[PDB]
Symmetry: D2
Subunit: 356 residues, 4 copies
């Protein structure tokens, strides 16, 4: 008998509350793609949401979908046209890869390309598996002093990078970050690395705020039932001035309203968090003071920068990882996520290397 | 006896529905001010609103206020430190003059200075009178080939310039202007002057839309009872694509919702029109497609540019003027404004020259 | 015998002074390419330079190269993955097509991609022939009201668009354009379409300046042996102020120096013209007044915009065409170019349609 | 007899090599000015240059001039219109104060105002004295946790802030700083504070480079006799790539040429150092790769930001101070500056407090 073939065990959502570990064929990379032996994949609230609800808005899992999109791995094989990567290279994977060079890609905002492929957003399969192929231009080599888990953390970190760029965060700024979930946390980390003088973070949880303090938050405000105007007043009271930039990472209407009231005239309110289809806000208050309201849709052009910041030790994302489980314990990892305790949970897909 | 002294008949609002023509003292210019013999003043919907309701939001006329803020005149006398203007100079008056060199002024956005002086916004008296003093830095000399009425039209034109700049309007753009009132009209003129390929204008009035066509609108859409989504669809149908920039000049919630649905991903929705304190909108739809929502608060750094466009005959605002009355017929002029027919009404304050 | 096959007569430079018309195989388009039946190709000074010198700087014709890069044509056949174009479509061809999605392409500046393919820049063959294949993302459909020659003129026009964008040209600006060759001319056209109040053009030739006046130049200055400071003084004397932007389209050292002296503090000097490897300039004078010096390397993201401006009749490039010859008379067309008389010369490659 | 009056001993340059300590009248603050009891003043190479040559370019000391412009002090008396400062307030002094609200001030670039007042640039007297009056808008209150010497260091630090802003320095950048003098050093500090991943510093002095390493330089290169191309090659070798931004702080032609060869295409070369009136450089090499060449003229809008970074301990400039002398030992201090050893020398003007 011939040698045993490798496997491609994958974490798949078939529908609401129907999560399974099953084997998939091993992908064959096209001329401009690379086949990766997956190593580390972080669990994102969105992967969990598809498992629980089978959809997010109008993005419905109509056929079984492999989960996972915050990842790193090792190049196993490269397509005939690939020259910048070779077998053995450790790489961080940027999940959104444009399918066509449309005007959004040409202008530098490929994240807005309508036909973009994106790991684990139906109907595109994610990378929580053993072997996964991806466009080579979107796999970036990791320096030796950057771990696989840091490589996987580049994905959420990039949301923070894109959000801060969209907000115009820069040297000396006072920034308000609403929400201390992983997104608010990486946003806090990025704001500080960019030179923000003070970053204030809000959240409903004292525990999450305590963690925010540990990683750099200068000020924190625990939210209970105060009004948006009251929160704005308290923030200003802590800073001694209004923040030039507010990055909204909760998606809650009251928080968006608070951001409008809190932001300094001429400043910027960045909307990262996802809320309802309709929202009631004091638009006039923002517009009349030229507080711009800018949304974020994932990110673009953040991997090389994230990699440089990690390699130079300019930012430390490691404290964000609270648990790590082998791929086979994915169900337990997802139930742990649901318990709300902990922060970033890593799934280790390579049996030969379960280390960070 | 001694020669008769000059008079300073002024148009004053004492409270809701209480408008009066009354004499004021002749102002004396400080070292950095000029005394102006007022010539032409355009009537703005806001002047009319203070007359009708005695307020706009929390800006209430608590003591009698002189109306008027879109104006031009002749330098009568200059303060000791004034060197760029001399008696006899014809000037356009920029109504917002900072009282202190705060951070907003230093950063180039003096329109956002909290303590700014602004003609006819309580408690600052306007310039619908015979003689008016103003900071010399904000009185701009008019070229001989630019009329007093064009000088007065620089004020509303500047709202259009500031809005197009804030919207990023540039060469080849498809622009949607919501509203065909004077503000939407100057926005249309500026958009075309800046190189917009196509400008679509919407409005409830077929008459105002016909006027829009006469001055440059490439496409017009009369709004009746369609929904925001339907209007957005019609606009895209007419343009063959989504406009990259939408400039909202109505302040109506339905129109703002239409702007969000109509604007191309990555584009900009500029809010000029004033609506209610609270607005219900598909915020998510804009944010998730990175459609920026930017407000406008009057303008900054637009007078020299407006003067250059008028002097070079690059834009024609003359068609906007539909009526002219001497200052003494201000009541008749305001009642005419209320009738709704016509567009820009000019008040002529200098008995020695009632021409354009 | 079978039907006669089509031909692909091409204009080829073998070396200095060695220009030939010869037949080439008919290209077969890949999945993402289209085969075009060439229609109109404008002659650029660079095509002429390769013919005369066999090189430009270190770009040497080491093997026979087909000339031509300012063109339009008709889609003859499309590759299996092409969906936005179909046989029969009239298209304008953007000559620079990136070979890889490197960081320059991802950031929106694909013109700087090191491995970019560019028609008629050795070793890449141009499009002065019957049939030519090209990446489909870089062939843009022309509206029915835009001619093939206007389609070909988009290439040089795009240099002007890119130059004006890099210069920050906008509403009300006073702009100085050095040089009245086709590049200075399209730059003048673009500056005016963008809202420049006044555009001053300089050149050694009175005839070229007369043409500049015909198409929109507000002021012109004929250059003889004046010093750079003297030219700067004269320009300022004509404008009554220093121009905010200067676009250098000659490549002559004295002109670059004049641009530094002429540009308003805080303004921008754009370098389009190609000069020597080393240049002596009053760098200090520019730096100390924050006059930025920005270069241009062809263009990026200009075709859709150029097409919208032509379709809306916002710019008229037709007057730039002074002669048109069928492909077979290319030698005569190039000798005519050398005579320096005339401006844009068009070569007509489609025997079935020799019209504009 | 009456109590002794205060004195205003000042350090004055009368001509080349003619420096004197002499008494001046006590200034009287106008309505919008404050009288300051000077505390700490850093010595700048320019103050020293006026002493040695009696001029810098065409800025010549035609009448005796008080030196000094990098300073902090205590508010002694305030003008009648001053409300944000009171006697006793510790303040950092921004030396450039516009005399008129011209277009440069209105647009947010007051540093370019032609008639600006600037301490110690003839004919404007500096602040190396006991009592000095200054426009109140340009005296900024220091937080209690920020020292007088840090307040004085805000001046050179601001050159670094303005240079990094002009260079577009941001998160993850690889930056080349040419020159390890105090200007290159503050530029290094700011670059790192803004998120630069790696900053390479060059200089002729190994001692200055050792100091650079101590405060944050990731890489250093001592320059001996290599050519500009060779240095550019070494820099790229060390970084493993070309720096996106180069900040030239030497003014040397060879260094500027090296910056052009070293900077990544699409990047920026910022010119801070002052060189000769004419410079020979590979302009083409920069222009054709769209490497922008941007100059710096001191700074604008940097004091509040600098104060926020110092107050938040985001940057440490203290290591820059190597010597301190009372005002009376100014001659000794200037001779020490000329010796070349050491970096920033502080002059202490307040006999009642000689501490940092
Ligand atoms: N637009 C994008 O491209 C993009 C990419 C990533 C994530 N997101 C979204 O960003 C949001 C943040 O995600 P995450 O993973 O950090 O989520 P999360 O659920 O872990 O964190 C959200 C936090 O908001 C806090 N919160 C809720 N209401 C609040 C209020 N009124 N005031 C203050 N704090 C409040 C919660 O206690 C929680 O800690 C989500 O809505 C996510 O879907 C958007
Ligand atoms: N933010 C600022 O700095 C600033 C400065 C000037 C004016 N404004 C505001 O801009 C707005 C426009 O002012 P104006 O003088 O042109 O006003 P206007 O009343 O003359 O014109 C408004 C136009 O909107 C049209 N309209 C109303 N609802 C509509 C809808 N749902 N769909 C389409 N069209 C609709 C009306 O028929 C009318 O022609 C006002 O709210 C004004 O107060 C703001
Ligand atoms: N960087 C790029 O991407 C790019 C793209 C297109 C063209 N170019 C270059 O731009 C330049 C313009 O090309 P073109 O086709 O219009 O060239 P051209 O030769 O037709 O025109 C150049 C003009 O400059 C004039 N001139 C020469 N010296 C002058 C001086 N001292 N003062 C004033 N006028 C002077 C000439 O009389 C002539 O009319 C060329 O150097 C070309 O190679 C650069
Ligand atoms: N434009 C402005 O607004 C502004 C404001 C401040 C200072 N400056 C200028 O910036 C420059 C730096 O000033 P500073 O106080 O730090 O000066 P400095 O003299 O103390 O430092 C200059 C450094 O350059 C080094 N150097 C000289 N030639 C070199 C070369 N070829 N390669 C590498 N290193 C070289 C010297 O060894 C020295 O350490 C000066 O020219 C100063 O006048 C400009
Ligand atoms: C369902 N989506 C496709 S969406 O367009 O409503 N939008 C949901 C929120 N988004 C999220 C959430 C979590 N992680 C990411 C990217 O890692 N994006 C960004 C995408
Ligand atoms: C009451 N105002 C002070 S306000 O801040 O609600 N806002 C109202 C709308 N604004 C208007 C309306 C008409 N004309 C102008 C300026 O000419 N501004 C701009 C100002
Ligand atoms: C030889 N070249 C490759 S180059 O890099 O020296 N540079 C030369 C001048 N350039 C020109 C000249 C004419 N037409 C074009 C583009 O149509 N580019 C831009 C390109
Ligand atoms: C003589 N000057 C007025 S100048 O315009 O040649 N230029 C010289 C260099 N400059 C310097 C040098 C040192 N310190 C400063 C500002 O603190 N500016 C900036 C000013
Ligand atoms: Zn995610
Ligand atoms: Zn108004
Ligand atoms: Zn060309
Ligand atoms: Zn200095």
């Amino acid at each position: 008998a011939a040698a045993a073939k490798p496997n491609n065990l994958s974490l798949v959502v078939h529908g609401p509350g129907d999560l399974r570990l099953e084997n998939y064929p091993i992908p064959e990379p096209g001329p401009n793609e690379v086949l990766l032996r997956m190593h580390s994949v972080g669990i994102c609230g969105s992967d969990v949401h598809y498992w629980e609800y089978g959809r997010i808005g109008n993005f419905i899992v109509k056929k079984p979908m492999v989960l996972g999109h915050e990842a790193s791995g090792t190049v196993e094989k490269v397509g005939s046209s690939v020259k910048h990567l070779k077998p053995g290279d450790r790489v961080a994977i940027e999940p959104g890869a444009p399918r066509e060079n449309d005007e959004f890609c040409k202008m530098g905002r490929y994240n807005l390309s309508p036909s973009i492929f994106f790991c684990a957003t139906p109907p595109d399969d994610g990378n929580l598996c053993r072997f996964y192929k991806h466009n080579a231009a979107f796999c970036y080599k990791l320096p030796d002093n950057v771990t696989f888990e840091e490589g996987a953390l580049i994905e959420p970190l990039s949301v923070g990078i894109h959000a801060c760029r969209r907000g115009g965060v820069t040297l000396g700024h006072k920034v308000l970050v609403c929400g201390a979930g992983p997104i608010g946390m990486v946003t806090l980390l990025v704001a500080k690395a960019m030179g923000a003088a003070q970053v204030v973070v809000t959240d409903l949880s004292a525990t999450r705020l305590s963690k925010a303090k540990e990683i750099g938050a200068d000020l924190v405000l625990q939210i209970s039932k105060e009004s948006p105007q009251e929160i704005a007043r308290k923030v200003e009271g802590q800073l001694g001035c209004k923040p030039e930039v507010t990055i909204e990472c909760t998606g809650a209407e009251a928080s968006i309203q608070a951001g409008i009231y809190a932001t300094r005239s001429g400043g910027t309110l960045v909307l990262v968090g996802l809320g309802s289809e309709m929202t009631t806000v004091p638009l006039l208050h923002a517009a009349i003071r030229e507080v711009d309201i800018k949304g974020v849709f994932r990110y673009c052009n953040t991997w090389p920068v994230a990699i440089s910041m990690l390699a130079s030790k300019s930012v430390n994302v490691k404290p964000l990882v609270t648990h790590r489980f082998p791929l086979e314990k994915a169900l337990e990892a997802f139930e742990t996520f649901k318990k709300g305790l902990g922060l970033k949970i890593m799934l280790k897909c390579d049996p030969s290397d379960q280390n960070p």
